[PDB]
């Protein structure tokens, strides 16, 4: 077997600036026919994988020449000279000298300036309530960087373990993220409390922003 | 045109079997080593097994994690590739790609679980700075995926359909939202179109400010 060790696991690059990805193999990728079967694939967000580079250094059609591949034996590198927005996604190396195995993947995001989210809170609808459950949703819109803290408070008491968050891929026009956080409470427990607050901490915000409502 | 099209993905019980198929065009299939590669939800690509040429006696080899349970086969006359999967396990849940590595298609999705198909309930996230938000909560479906559009595809800009999350219940949920200049409420109507093919279920939900 040949284990492929890919680093780094993630890259955050300003457009205009270069990106570099290492792939190392646990044994030589030099095949017995004198050729070296190291390939790079890109999987763009929500797409199928597609090959970019084959035989170490050769570009598939339609691949910009900003992309280059190098190396030999156990050591290979993918370089992107001047990142552009279309480069975003997960890169994998994949050897074909002994069957196939893949690198663990390198997630490329575009670096951009800080942008604070705008925040919205939605109570559970009346239709949901009938049925036994209450979902309280907090939406964070168009922010960068990805890192954010979203905290729920019910009549001032900090919740834990009862919310789940979900994040979009980088917006393809402005490179920001959006996030939703959903608090699950029983219907009876929802109707027993008054003040529902989503508090958001993020480096684009002077101090934490709170969106809240009262059940009435 | 190079084309690779997987089929036969679906939900099956732990321990059951399933047989995937794959048709290919636009390259010399009979001269190509052909593979199955899979991707478990939210994880990396994993080579599953390979089949070589007639002149290699159609030699096959398998990932250690599927060895003895899966069988790759091919039929160069039909430009087809097959995967017979027995003794299926939970962790075999993935998208399955039929690929020579040079070229790739869309994949077929395999879900290994004991849970029954359930269509979603759709709940409004009502609106009420310069921008307003609204949306739809698509809650308690199994299995993935659901599809959400707005106004039959006419409303697209400002839309954020989030990655589904798996609840402690074993059922999935997601929200789809749209951010809109405040005044476009009252001048636009908002209906989310939700489709869940596994349960053969379609829902449309007009979203509007509560009173």
């Amino acid at each position: 077997d040949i284990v492929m060790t890919q680093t780094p696991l993630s890259l955050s690059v300003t457009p205009g600036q270069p990106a570099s990805i290492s792939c190392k193999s646990s044994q030589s990728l030099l095949y017995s026919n004198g050729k070296t079967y190291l390939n790079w694939v890109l999987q763009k967000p929500g797409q199928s994988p597609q090959r970019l580079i084959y035989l170490v250094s050769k570009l598939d059609s339609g691949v910009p020449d900003r992309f280059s591949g190098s190396g030999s034996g156990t050591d290979f590198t993918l370089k992107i000279s001047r990142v552009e927005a279309e480069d975003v996604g997960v890169y994998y190396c994949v050897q074909g000298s002994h069957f196939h195995t893949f690198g663990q993947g390198t997630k490329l995001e575009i670096k951009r300036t800080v942008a604070a989210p705008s925040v919205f809170i939605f109570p559970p609808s009346d239709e949901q309530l009938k049925s036994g459950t209450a979902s309280v949703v907090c939406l964070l819109n168009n922010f960068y960087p990805r890192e954010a803290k979203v905290q729920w408070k019910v009549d001032n008491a900090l919740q834990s373990g009862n919310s789940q968050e979900s994040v979009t891929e980088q917006d393809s026009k402005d490179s920001t993220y959006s996030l939703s956080s959903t608090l699950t409470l029983s219907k009876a427990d929802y109707e027993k409390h008054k003040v529902y607050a989503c508090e958001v901490t993020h480096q684009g915000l002077s101090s934490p922003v709170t969106k809240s409502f009262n059940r009435g | 045109e190079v084309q690779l099209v997987e089929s036969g993905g679906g939900l099956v019980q732990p321990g059951g079997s399933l047989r995937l198929s794959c048709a290919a065009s636009g390259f010399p299939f009979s001269n190509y080593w052909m593979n199955w590669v899979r991707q478990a939800p939210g994880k990396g690509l994993e080579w599953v097994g390979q089949i070589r040429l007639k002149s290699n006696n159609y030699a096959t080899h398998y990932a250690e994690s599927v060895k003895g349970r899966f069988t790759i086969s091919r039929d160069d006359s039909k430009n087809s590739l097959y995967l017979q999967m027995n003794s299926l396990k939970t962790e075999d849940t993935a998208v399955y790609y039929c690929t020579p590595i040079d070229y790739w298609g869309q994949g077929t999705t395999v879900t290994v679980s004991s849970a029954s198909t359930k269509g979603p309930s759709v709940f409004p996230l009502a609106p009420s700075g310069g921008t307003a938000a609204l949306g739809c909560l698509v809650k308690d479906y199994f299995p993935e995926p659901v599809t959400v559009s707005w106004n039959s595809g006419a409303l697209t800009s400002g839309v954020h359909t989030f990655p589904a999350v798996l609840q402690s219940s074993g059922l999935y949920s997601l929200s789809s939202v749209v951010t809109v200049p405040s005044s476009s409420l009252g001048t636009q109507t908002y209906i989310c179109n939700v489709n869940h093919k596994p349960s053969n279920t379609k829902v449309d939900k007009k979203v509007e400010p509560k009173s």
């Binding site: 084959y54 994949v94 | 010399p28 001269n31 080593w33 070589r52 020579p100 590595i101 040079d102």
Partner: peptide, 9 residues
């Protein structure tokens, strides 16, 4: 058309 280059087929 083209021959495979991801592996030594």
């Amino acid at each position: 058309d083209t021959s495979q280059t991801s592996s030594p087929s």
